[PDB]
Design a protein around this motif. Structure first.
Motif, PDB file in Angstrom:
ATOM      1  N   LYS A  19      40.424  28.247  44.427  1.00 47.90           N
ATOM      2  CA  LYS A  19      41.253  28.930  45.468  1.00 47.90           C
ATOM      3  C   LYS A  19      41.719  30.319  45.095  1.00 47.90           C
ATOM      4  N   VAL A  70      38.454  41.451  50.209  1.00 48.42           N
ATOM      5  CA  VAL A  70      37.340  40.493  50.347  1.00 48.42           C
ATOM      6  C   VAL A  70      36.313  41.036  51.378  1.00 48.42           C
ATOM      7  N   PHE A 107      41.570  34.457  44.079  1.00 49.27           N
ATOM      8  CA  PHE A 107      40.997  35.620  44.687  1.00 49.27           C
ATOM      9  C   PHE A 107      39.606  35.880  44.149  1.00 49.27           C
ATOM     10  N   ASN A 108      39.385  35.578  42.860  1.00 53.88           N
ATOM     11  CA  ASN A 108      38.027  35.713  42.301  1.00 53.88           C
ATOM     12  C   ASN A 108      37.119  34.708  42.980  1.00 53.88           C
ATOM     13  N   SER A 113      37.401  33.522  45.969  1.00 48.52           N
ATOM     14  CA  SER A 113      37.079  34.037  47.323  1.00 48.52           C
ATOM     15  C   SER A 113      35.999  35.047  47.272  1.00 48.52           C
ATOM     16  N   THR A 148      41.833  43.148  38.688  1.00 46.90           N
ATOM     17  CA  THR A 148      42.797  43.595  37.672  1.00 46.90           C
ATOM     18  C   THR A 148      44.159  43.181  37.998  1.00 46.90           C
ATOM     19  N   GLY A 149      45.015  43.170  36.972  1.00 44.51           N
ATOM     20  CA  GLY A 149      46.441  43.064  37.232  1.00 44.51           C
ATOM     21  C   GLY A 149      47.102  44.441  37.445  1.00 44.51           C
ATOM     22  N   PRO A 203      38.176  38.079  36.407  1.00 47.09           N
ATOM     23  CA  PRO A 203      39.371  38.919  36.194  1.00 47.09           C
ATOM     24  C   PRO A 203      39.301  39.666  34.847  1.00 47.09           C
ATOM     25  N   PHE A 249      41.266  44.400  28.952  1.00 43.02           N
ATOM     26  CA  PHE A 249      40.299  45.522  29.219  1.00 43.02           C
ATOM     27  C   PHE A 249      38.866  45.058  29.080  1.00 43.02           C
ATOM     28  N   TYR A 264      46.220  31.093  35.223  1.00 51.46           N
ATOM     29  CA  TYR A 264      46.390  30.937  33.780  1.00 51.46           C
ATOM     30  C   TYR A 264      47.565  31.816  33.240  1.00 51.46           C
ATOM     31  N   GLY A 265      47.638  33.076  33.670  1.00 50.16           N
ATOM     32  CA  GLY A 265      48.676  34.020  33.207  1.00 50.16           C
ATOM     33  C   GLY A 265      50.093  33.482  33.548  1.00 50.16           C
ATOM     34  N   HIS A 274      36.177  32.157  36.620  1.00 53.84           N
ATOM     35  CA  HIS A 274      37.559  31.958  36.956  1.00 53.84           C
ATOM     36  C   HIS A 274      37.821  30.453  36.987  1.00 53.84           C
ATOM     37  N   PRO A 297      45.139  42.404  43.181  1.00 52.06           N
ATOM     38  CA  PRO A 297      45.351  41.459  44.290  1.00 52.06           C
ATOM     39  C   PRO A 297      46.700  40.700  44.337  1.00 52.06           C
ATOM     40  N   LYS A 350      42.891  39.822  52.143  1.00 53.30           N
ATOM     41  CA  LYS A 350      41.951  39.490  53.221  1.00 53.30           C
ATOM     42  C   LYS A 350      40.997  40.661  53.317  1.00 53.30           C
ATOM     43  N   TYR A 390      40.399  40.648  31.392  1.00 54.83           N
ATOM     44  CA  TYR A 390      41.290  40.061  30.352  1.00 54.83           C
ATOM     45  C   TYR A 390      41.217  41.022  29.175  1.00 54.83           C
TER      46      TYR A 390
HETATM   47  C1  FAD Z   1      44.645  36.648  29.199  1.00 54.68           C
HETATM   48  C2  FAD Z   1      44.821  37.687  30.287  1.00 54.68           C
HETATM   49  C3  FAD Z   1      44.531  39.019  29.989  1.00 54.68           C
HETATM   50  C4  FAD Z   1      44.691  39.992  31.003  1.00 54.68           C
HETATM   51  N1  FAD Z   1      44.403  41.292  30.733  1.00 54.68           N
HETATM   52  C5  FAD Z   1      44.502  42.210  31.720  1.00 54.68           C
HETATM   53  C6  FAD Z   1      44.145  43.617  31.497  1.00 54.68           C
HETATM   54  O1  FAD Z   1      43.697  43.985  30.394  1.00 54.68           O
HETATM   55  N2  FAD Z   1      44.330  44.492  32.489  1.00 54.68           N
HETATM   56  C7  FAD Z   1      44.812  44.138  33.709  1.00 54.68           C
HETATM   57  O2  FAD Z   1      44.915  45.017  34.615  1.00 54.68           O
HETATM   58  N3  FAD Z   1      45.130  42.889  33.999  1.00 54.68           N
HETATM   59  C8  FAD Z   1      45.002  41.891  33.073  1.00 54.68           C
HETATM   60  N4  FAD Z   1      45.325  40.549  33.358  1.00 54.68           N
HETATM   61  C9  FAD Z   1      45.768  40.150  34.727  1.00 54.68           C
HETATM   62  C10 FAD Z   1      44.487  39.617  35.478  1.00 54.68           C
HETATM   63  O3  FAD Z   1      43.414  40.570  35.415  1.00 54.68           O
HETATM   64  C11 FAD Z   1      44.825  39.394  36.928  1.00 54.68           C
HETATM   65  O4  FAD Z   1      45.867  38.435  36.896  1.00 54.68           O
HETATM   66  C12 FAD Z   1      43.671  38.787  37.725  1.00 54.68           C
HETATM   67  O5  FAD Z   1      42.628  39.750  37.812  1.00 54.68           O
HETATM   68  C13 FAD Z   1      44.116  38.384  39.159  1.00 54.68           C
HETATM   69  O6  FAD Z   1      42.918  37.903  39.863  1.00 54.68           O
HETATM   70  P1  FAD Z   1      42.883  36.372  40.371  1.00 54.68           P
HETATM   71  O7  FAD Z   1      41.603  35.999  41.067  1.00 54.68           O
HETATM   72  O8  FAD Z   1      43.342  35.486  39.231  1.00 54.68           O
HETATM   73  O9  FAD Z   1      44.067  36.530  41.538  1.00 54.68           O
HETATM   74  P2  FAD Z   1      44.897  35.334  42.237  1.00 54.68           P
HETATM   75  O10 FAD Z   1      46.295  35.385  41.647  1.00 54.68           O
HETATM   76  O11 FAD Z   1      44.158  34.025  42.334  1.00 54.68           O
HETATM   77  O12 FAD Z   1      45.009  35.792  43.764  1.00 54.68           O
HETATM   78  C14 FAD Z   1      45.818  36.841  44.247  1.00 54.68           C
HETATM   79  C15 FAD Z   1      46.202  36.246  45.600  1.00 54.68           C
HETATM   80  O13 FAD Z   1      45.048  36.124  46.458  1.00 54.68           O
HETATM   81  C16 FAD Z   1      45.050  34.792  47.011  1.00 54.68           C
HETATM   82  N5  FAD Z   1      43.718  34.483  47.574  1.00 54.68           N
HETATM   83  C17 FAD Z   1      42.785  33.555  47.249  1.00 54.68           C
HETATM   84  N6  FAD Z   1      41.700  33.681  48.076  1.00 54.68           N
HETATM   85  C18 FAD Z   1      41.936  34.717  48.931  1.00 54.68           C
HETATM   86  C19 FAD Z   1      41.261  35.407  50.073  1.00 54.68           C
HETATM   87  N7  FAD Z   1      40.025  35.039  50.503  1.00 54.68           N
HETATM   88  N8  FAD Z   1      41.911  36.431  50.684  1.00 54.68           N
HETATM   89  C20 FAD Z   1      43.127  36.837  50.299  1.00 54.68           C
HETATM   90  N9  FAD Z   1      43.803  36.268  49.292  1.00 54.68           N
HETATM   91  C21 FAD Z   1      43.271  35.228  48.587  1.00 54.68           C
HETATM   92  C22 FAD Z   1      45.575  33.918  45.912  1.00 54.68           C
HETATM   93  O14 FAD Z   1      45.934  32.621  46.396  1.00 54.68           O
HETATM   94  C23 FAD Z   1      46.718  34.814  45.411  1.00 54.68           C
HETATM   95  O15 FAD Z   1      47.931  34.681  46.174  1.00 54.68           O
HETATM   96  C24 FAD Z   1      45.169  39.590  32.359  1.00 54.68           C
HETATM   97  C25 FAD Z   1      45.503  38.261  32.638  1.00 54.68           C
HETATM   98  C26 FAD Z   1      45.366  37.298  31.622  1.00 54.68           C
HETATM   99  C27 FAD Z   1      45.677  35.844  31.967  1.00 54.68           C
END
Ligand code: FAD
Ligand code: FAD
Ligand code: MXX
Ligand code: MXX
Ligand code: ZN
Ligand code: ZN
Lengths: 230, 230
Positions: free
Chosen positions: A15, A204, A17-18, A20, A148-149, A102, A106, B67-68, A11, A192, A201, A104
Motif C-alpha cells: 500500500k 503517480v 507510495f512506491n 503505487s 525521497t524524504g 525509496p 543517498f 519502516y522509518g 519496498h 510524498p 495522486k 535510503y
Molecule cells: C533507512 C532509511 C534511510 C533513508 N534515507 C533517506 C535519504 O538519504 N534521503 C531522503 O531524502 N530520504 C531518506 N529516507 C526517507 C525515505 O526515502 C522516504 O521515507 C520514502 O522514500 C517515502 O516513500 P514511501 O513509498 O515509503 O512513501 P509512503 O509513506 O508509503 O507514502 C506516502 C503517502 O502516499 C500514500 N499512498 C500510497 N499509494 C498511493 C497513491 N496511489 N497515491 C497517493 N498516495 C499514495 C501512502 O499511504 C502515504 O500516506 C530514508 C528512510 C529510511 C527508512
C-alpha cells in the motif's frame, strides 16, 4: 511490437507510495502490450549478502575466498546460486530495467544493493573488455524511479543535501553505465509523505503519463559533466 | 589516549587485504592503549534487510507498514530487535568509528549498507530536525578505509571512474555527516590485486603509520566543494 520490461522493486509495503508507482508502471506497460516481469525483492526475501553460498558445487579455491573471482568463474561454469541466475535471466531478456525504491542514505536500500552486488556479476554484466560504453549489457535501457524524504529544494546545488545528481552518480554511472546500460532520466518523486493526498495522486499520474512515451525517450549523457558540471 | 574505537568490518575472508588492514588497525590502536571493538559483519551473518522483524512490539500503524516511522517509535520504546541495539551500544560508546570495506559498485557492500540502514535509525543517529551539524552523533569521528579494484589513475577527474571523492559523497556527507559525525580524511587503498607484494605491505604500513597519529587529525570540511570542487 514488442518490448520486455523488468521492474526491480524494493519496498516492504504494497500500500506504499512506491507500491503505487510499481503498480501503475505494471498497469501502463501491460496496457501498451509490453512483456512485464517484477522482482519484488522483499516478498522474495532476496538474499543481499555476497557469500560463498552464491557458488554451488566446489570453489575454484577453498583456501582463500575471493568473491569476485569465484563468482566470475561460477558464472562461466554455470555454477551460481539459482536466485542469482533467475535474476540474470530476467535481465538478459529485458529491454528496459526499471528500479523502483525509496532513497535510503543517498542510495538504494541494502536489499536492492545486494541485488546489484550479486546479480551484476563479472562475465554477465561486465568483463575485460566490456565496461562503460561496451559493458556486457549494452542495448538495454535502465531507469531509476526513486522516492525521497527530502524536498526538491533540499536537493539543490546549495541546498543541505546537495544536488540530486550527486547521489545518482554511483548508481547511474558507477553501476548502470558501467554495465553498458543507456540510462534514462531518473524519475524522482520528492517527498510524498508530507502529501497532499492529491499531489500524490498526481505524482503517480505523472509517472504513468511519462511511461506512455518511454520508448521515444533519449538516454541522458551519463557523464561526470551531466552529474556534477554545469 | 583513553579513547574507544569501533571498527565496522565487511569482508568475507580473514586472509584478505581488508582483513590485514582491519588487523593492523586493531594491533596499532590496541598498542596505543585504546579500547577496541570490531563488528565483523559477515562472521556475524549480520541481517541487512530493513523489515518488520526489526520491531518486536505492537506496530504504530499495522495496516500500512512504514519502516522509518515504525523503527523511530520502536527505538523510543525499546522494542527494536537486539541485533540493532547491540550495534547502537557499540556506536554510542565509541569515540571513533572506522569502516573497513572493499568498494562494491562505487559504494559499500550490501551487508554494510544494511548496517547503516538498520543501525542508524531515527531517534538514535538523527532526528527531523537534528541532522548534519545537529545530528545526534555529534562529537564522534568517523573514517572510511576503502579498498578498490580500480587504480588511483582510474579514480581521477579525467580517469574513467571519475574522482575518488565523487563516490564518497553519499557515505561521508549523506550518511556520516547527516548523523553528526565529523569525518576524517578517507584512507583509500587502491588496487591491491594489481599492486606488487611490497606495495601491498607498504599500503598496510601506511595505514598502521597513519593510525599512530589519528587523534591529532582534524576532520575534513564535509561539503559539496570538498567533494566536487567547482
Ligand atoms: C533507512 C532509511 C534511510 C533513508 N534515507 C533517506 C535519504 O538519504 N534521503 C531522503 O531524502 N530520504 C531518506 N529516507 C526517507 C525515505 O526515502 C522516504 O521515507 C520514502 O522514500 C517515502 O516513500 P514511501 O513509498 O515509503 O512513501 P509512503 O509513506 O508509503 O507514502 C506516502 C503517502 O502516499 C500514500 N499512498 C500510497 N499509494 C498511493 C497513491 N496511489 N497515491 C497517493 N498516495 C499514495 C501512502 O499511504 C502515504 O500516506 C530514508 C528512510 C529510511 C527508512
Ligand atoms: C560485487 C563487487 C563490486 C565491486 N565494485 C567495485 C567498484 O565499484 N569499484 C572498484 O574500484 N572496485 C570494485 N570491486 C573490486 C574491489 O573493490 C575489490 O576487489 C577489493 O577492493 C580488493 O580488496 P580485497 O581485500 O578483496 O583484496 P585481496 O584480493 O584480498 O588482496 C590482494 C591480496 O593481497 C593479499 N594480502 C592480504 N594481506 C596482505 C598483506 N598484509 N600484505 C600483502 N598482501 C596481502 C592477499 O594475499 C591477496 O594477494 C568490486 C568487487 C565486487 C566483488
Ligand atoms: C535516514 O535519512 C533520512 C531519513 C529521513 C529523511 O526525511 C524523512 C531524510 C533522510 C536524509 C538522509 C536526508 C533527507 O533530506 N531526509 C528528509
Ligand atoms: C563491479 O565493479 C568492478 C569490479 C571489479 C573491478 O576491478 C577489479 C572494478 C569494478 C569497477 C566498477 C570499477 C573499477 O575500476 N574496477 C577495477
Ligand atoms: Zn556514465
Ligand atoms: Zn558533509
Amino acid at each position: 511490437a514488442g518490448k520486455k520490461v523488468l521492474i526491480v522493486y524494493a519496498h516492504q509495503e504494497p500500500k506504499s507510495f512506491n507500491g503505487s508507482l510499481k503498480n501503475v508502471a505494471v498497469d501502463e506497460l501491460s496496457r501498451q502490450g509490453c512483456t512485464v516481469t517484477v522482482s519484488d525483492l522483499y516478498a522474495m526475501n532476496f538474499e543481499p549478502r555476497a557469500t560463498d553460498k552464491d557458488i554451488t558445487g566446489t570453489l575454484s579455491n577453498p583456501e582463500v575466498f575471493n568473491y569476485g573471482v569465484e563468482t566470475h568463474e561460477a558464472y562461466k561454469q554455470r555454477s551460481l546460486a539459482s536466485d542469482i541466475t533467475d535474476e540474470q535471466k530476467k535481465v538478459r531478456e529485458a529491454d528496459l530495467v526499471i528500479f523502483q525504491f525509496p532513497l535510503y542514505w543517498f542510495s538504494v536500500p541494502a536489499i536492492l544493493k545486494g541485488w546489484m552486488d550479486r546479480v551484476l556479476c563479472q562475465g554477465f554484466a561486465f568483463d575485460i573488455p566490456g565496461f562503460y560504453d561496451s559493458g556486457l549489457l549494452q542495448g538495454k535501457l535502465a531507469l531509476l524511479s526513486v522516492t525521497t524524504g527530502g524536498t526538491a529544494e533540499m536537493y539543490t546545488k546549495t541546498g543541505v543535501n546537495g544536488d540530486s545528481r550527486y547521489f545518482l552518480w554511483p548508481l547511474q554511472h558507477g553501476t548502470l553505465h558501467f554495465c553498458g546500460f543507456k540510462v534514462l532520466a531518473p524519475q524522482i518523486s520528492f517527498a510524498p509523505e508530507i502529501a497532499s493526498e492529491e499531489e500524490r495522486k498526481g505524482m503517480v499520474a505523472a509517472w504513468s503519463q511519462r511511461l506512455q512515451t518511454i520508448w521515444k525517450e533519449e538516454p541522458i549523457p551519463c557523464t561526470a559533466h551531466w552529474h556534477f558540471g554545469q
